[PDB]
Amino acid sequence: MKCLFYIAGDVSNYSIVNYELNGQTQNTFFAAHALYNLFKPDKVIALIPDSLVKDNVSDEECYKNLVINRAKELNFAGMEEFMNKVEIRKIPNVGIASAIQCENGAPKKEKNKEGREVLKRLPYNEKRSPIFIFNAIYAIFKDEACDEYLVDLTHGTNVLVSIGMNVGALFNAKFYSAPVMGMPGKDSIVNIVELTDVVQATNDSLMIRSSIENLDERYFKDYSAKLSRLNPTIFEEEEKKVLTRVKGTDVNVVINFLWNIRNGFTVNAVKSMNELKNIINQLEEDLEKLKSFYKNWEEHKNFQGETLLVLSDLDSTLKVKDLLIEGNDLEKLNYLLDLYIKASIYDKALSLARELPVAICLNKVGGGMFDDKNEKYKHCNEIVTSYLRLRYSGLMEFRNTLMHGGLSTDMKPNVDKDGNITPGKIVTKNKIEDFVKRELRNYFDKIVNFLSSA
Amino acid sequence: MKCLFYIAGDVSNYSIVNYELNGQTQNTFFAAHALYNLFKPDKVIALIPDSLVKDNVSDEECYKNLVINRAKELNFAGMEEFMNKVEIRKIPNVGIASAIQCENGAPKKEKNKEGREVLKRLPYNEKRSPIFIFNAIYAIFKDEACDEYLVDLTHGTNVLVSIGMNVGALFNAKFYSAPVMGMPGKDSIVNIVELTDVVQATNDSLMIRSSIENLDERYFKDYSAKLSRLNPTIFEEEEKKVLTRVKGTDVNVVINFLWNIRNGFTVNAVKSMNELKNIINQLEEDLEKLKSFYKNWEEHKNFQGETLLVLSDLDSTLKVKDLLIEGNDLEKLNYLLDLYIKASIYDKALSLARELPVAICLNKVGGGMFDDKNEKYKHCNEIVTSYLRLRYSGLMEFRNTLMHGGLSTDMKPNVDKDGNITPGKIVTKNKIEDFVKRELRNYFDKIVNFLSSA
């Protein structure tokens, strides 16, 4: 059960036009009607501000009559399923507006000495909060319990269409708008454009910039599906060069790189690092060409109407350059530790801060594998384990508490004879946080300090 | 270095008004000017669509002249120093628009048989994609490299203000718009509204809705700071009741509940669960009251200006009812395992799936502490460890592979005398993904089935 919302707006001076949205066309005089017939929602919500219509009992019924009083002035078709299958809900607006005056569900007409016009008593000055209007729009949206949504922004004030769009994004809502901008008389095909792709594409970039900042791959929205079907009809052989080098920027390598980081596979994360420097460098200068095309779009068409390829998806990916450091793999892990601390992922930070110091000696002792069989590891792990317990009683104690959690030999909870626990250990939280974010890198450095001269 | 952008718009018919934004007032004839004097940006960007101004050399030069040619008709003071501290950058628009025609950097004036006017040749009809306009505005915003941003939406088409707002959100921009909707003559104070809080309030809810779905607390934006200073001046002593139950809605316990889950303190997370069911009960039935207030906002205007308290922040918090199951703490963990799999965090899922069956025996065996001294644990852990290695060699095999990452006795990389790795135990993303998501719960249930009869 779909719903489709729109902003009301005064429609007494709109003309009959052919609105078109993706091949299908309809002949009405305002977008909501033309949009209604295209998608056939099970109900429709009108959302009429105070900027039009206020009488003494129920303003809502005057609006229903103003469209009927205008469907007469243009002798437009039946249109009666619309008026009898529409739920109208009044919403606030912000001051400087000028409001129509109705009387008892019919619009007040008055004399202008030349021709007959409607009585606008322009009394609308109201100082309202945007979050107040926002809260009011949210309440309408939640309490209709729809599935699909759909939203028309064609006909609202600059301030309301702004607030309405943000509410719609909370409901998997598709956005539609037809730029009226003047009266083209009867006919002159006006195009309705689908704003849904923009709203989706901006939340996509907030997740990505923060998926890199938090080292979490389940936030990186996978737009590789998009670049595959990225095919315009006619693009120049200069654009063919940069655009076909972007279709090939294999974003899978950066998702795999995060997944490997998130789950603790520091090896295939560090190993895979120098390969990303190739990918984001190619994407760095491939965006810079693309970034230059859209900068002076002037007569840079071909694109000029292509739905795929969003610069935001690319430029937000470039923040993954922050997770890349040039150098040798043992020092790449040393950087990866710091990444595990800026982002607040504590367990992996401790375990690497313990295991990396063993590898850094293995280098100093001429290399060896990480098995107990390998004697050079067996003995470096001893020095690390023993030096820790000598001066840094703290490090291992925390790491052991984060690896095995509550419900472990380490926390010692007390399962009672009835199915519920009585844990015997305070989760320390800030002592944990104060240690990892303020101490760990320093403890780690003093460990490697001692091991250098081996 | 601040910036302040605005949408251009036709200024030939704007009048002189008192723009007001937070006590301060400035006196100009279009909002973008008044905003500049208030915030003192280091530069200003014009952003001229094609919807106004088309001449033969530089469309950019006519707008700057069209603002001055209106700065004469109202003999407004400054403006000509302003006009050259404004860098004019041309942006696209979408069809049916009707454009002014300039000639040589001055607007073409014509004779209207009544009065002298500028020739609007209404030749603007364009089929552009919204993302195209978006990409071009993005290029403008990124390549200006500001610190603060600021954006005026007072003066743009509905389609541009939609697309423009989304660009601003990727640059931590504060949004401003003045509801024009008509000419209020000279004076009649027009108010600048700050749309910035709405945009923040909707991404804040996107992060909250996704913080619960992924069991990650560093996404939950904490609005409790807001509720502390949430106190209106005059609120009815019915609203005093419901609103005083919201300042006290202690959200700190739900963030702590997330942090405890992400880091593995499954005990004190589960222990704290039955306390949360009380909290979302109060916030659920307190949200329904608030939601009805904004449902009859028509005369409930003691909020008509309250900036704090966003419904989205509250209603999005309610999604945590999804992480709640009533019952005894042993079965609450049994649900917590499933949660560690819905959200794709495998290690905590595996490690809980191993230690929980040890607890589930202790109940059946009359309770005991989780320490090695306590023989009841000592012997239950033996049975599970032994039954696993008999029938489920896999569970522990992966669990041990996820707790300890690469750089461990379990993965066996080789660290060579030059500072490189070389992985040993190759386990792929999908072998892990397939095991936890498809098998673990079945392996886990059959363990408890066997242990039931103890």
Numbering used by the authors:
A (entry chain D), B (entry chain C): 1 to 454
From the paper:
SisCsx1, as other members of the Csm6/Csx1 family, is composed of an N-terminal CRISPR-Cas-associated Rossmann Fold (CARF) domain connected to an α-helical higher eukaryotes and prokaryotes nucleotide-binding (HEPN) domain by a helix-turn-helix (HTH) domain. Each dimer contains a cOA4 binding site at the vertex of the triangular assembly, and a catalytic pocket located 70 Å away inside the triangular oligomer along the two-fold dimer axis.
A SEC-MALLS analysis revealed that SisCsx1 is an oligomer of 300 kDa corresponding to a hexameric assembly. A cryoEM map of the complex at medium resolution was used as a model to solve the phase problem by molecular replacement in an apo SisCsx1 crystal belonging to the P21 space group. The hydrophobic interface is flanked by several polar interactions.
